[PDB]
Design a protein around this ligand. Structure first.
Ligand SMILES: NC(=[NH2+])NCCC[C@H](N)C(=O)O
Ligand SMILES: [K+]
Ligand SMILES: [K+]
Length: 353
């Protein structure tokens, strides 16, 4: 247990230097530079979490990498509360439809049977993916995980994953001792992660590499888990075609099975807690690649059509359609925004001459 107040001279010196470095760079467009006013900085710079995490453990990645988009990470779950004067305005700027005073709703994956066929003929949708993240309750996040923590957490995760049955049965590949053969195989699958880039390095997210880091996938290669890549868990369900029901059902079954053994870190206002605040709330990152060549003639598709369902469009005539909303709605609501939006877009495509 650490005290809520008092940071040492070195930490205080590095914070002041970091604030200055941010100020000097007038071209810097990170949300960190935007939101860390001198007033907020002066208020919170001498605070700590009970894990001993300071403001430097929050902002350092965005200081060392001025080109960061967001620029902060949570060094532990308590950081979201202790440094809320910074996290809150950043979270509410980035996320769509979430504002201070809101409480993210309790988890609810909803009724899977309400998802029908979207494109069973395979005339439109190229691929379907739904990604979630989780932190394991009772553990620090990267900058203050100990080596023993990494080992203990990995054992817990692998015990869960290695007990999955049926549609989820698969193999765990530790990063520790990973062979060149397995690296090559996983790269072909787009399943491999490696030591973090410059943003994760500066966040102290890569200590004790690669202890406690690993990759799991089912035999069908339609379910992927990363252990300790950035979050404790990154959990993805995916397949070719447009069967969003099947993709989502498989994800729900996996997360429920994992939760039975391992509780997840959770916050009364922010939902599931993650290392990067961009992944809060439901944590859902759904992405569907869809061929809409007739609609491609007019970006009445982007704003307006997809946007009516809070979906984002990104580009011949194939688009990645994703959910704008991650916080302030249930899992069911987010996946149904995707379902309903994709249904409207497909209607527009067929009706278009
Ligand atoms: N993997 C992520 N969490 N990406 C989003 C944030 C990445 C980086 N820290 C930035 O602000 O640009
Ligand atoms: K916003
Ligand atoms: K909302």
């Amino acid at each position: 247990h650490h005290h809520h107040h008092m940071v040492d001279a070195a930490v205080a010196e590095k914070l002041e230097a970091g604030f200055q470095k941010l100020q000097e760079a007038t071209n810097c467009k990170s949300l960190l530079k935007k939101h860390l006013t001198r007033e907020i900085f002066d208020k919170i710079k001498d605070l700590k979490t009970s894990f001993g995490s300071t403001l430097l453990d929050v902002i350092q990645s965005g200081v060392e990498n001025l080109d960061s988009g967001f620029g902060v990470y949570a060094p532990d779950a308590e950081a979201y509360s202790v440094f809320n004067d910074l996290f809150e305005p950043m979270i509410c700027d980035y996320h769509t439809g979430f504002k201070p005073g809101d409480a993210h709703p309790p988890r609810d994956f909803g009724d899977l049977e309400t998802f029908g066929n979207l494109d069973p003929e395979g005339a439109f949708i190229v691929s379907t993916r739904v990604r979630c993240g989780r932190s394991l309750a009772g553990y620090a996040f990267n900058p203050c995980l100990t080596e023993a923590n990494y080992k203990e957490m990995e054992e817990k995760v692998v015990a869960s994953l290695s007990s999955l049955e049926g549609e989820l049965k698969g193999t765990y590949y530790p990063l520790t001792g990973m062979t060149k053969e397995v690296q090559t195989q996983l790269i072909q699958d787009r399943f491999l992660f490696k030591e973090g880039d410059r943003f994760l390095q500066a966040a102290n997210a890569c200590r004790y590499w690669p202890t406690g880091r690993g990759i799991y996938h089912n035999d069908a290669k339609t379910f992927l888990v990363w252990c300790n890549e950035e979050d404790h868990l990154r959990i993805i369900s995916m397949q070719k075609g447009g069967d969003l029901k099947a993709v989502y059902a498989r994800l729900v079954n996996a997360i429920n099975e994992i939760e039975k053994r391992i509780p997840f870190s959770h916050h009364d206002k922010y939902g599931f807690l993650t290392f990067c605040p961009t992944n809060l709330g439901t944590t859902i990152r759904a992405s569907v690649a869809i061929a809409l060549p007739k609609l491609a003639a007019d970006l009445a598709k982007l704003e307006e059509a997809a946007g009516k369902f809070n979906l984002q469009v990104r580009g011949g005539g194939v688009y990645d359609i994703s959910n704008k909303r991650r916080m302030g709605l249930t899992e069911y609501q987010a996946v149904k925004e995707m379902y309903d939006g994709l249904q409207e877009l497909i209607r527009m495509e067929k009706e278009a001459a």
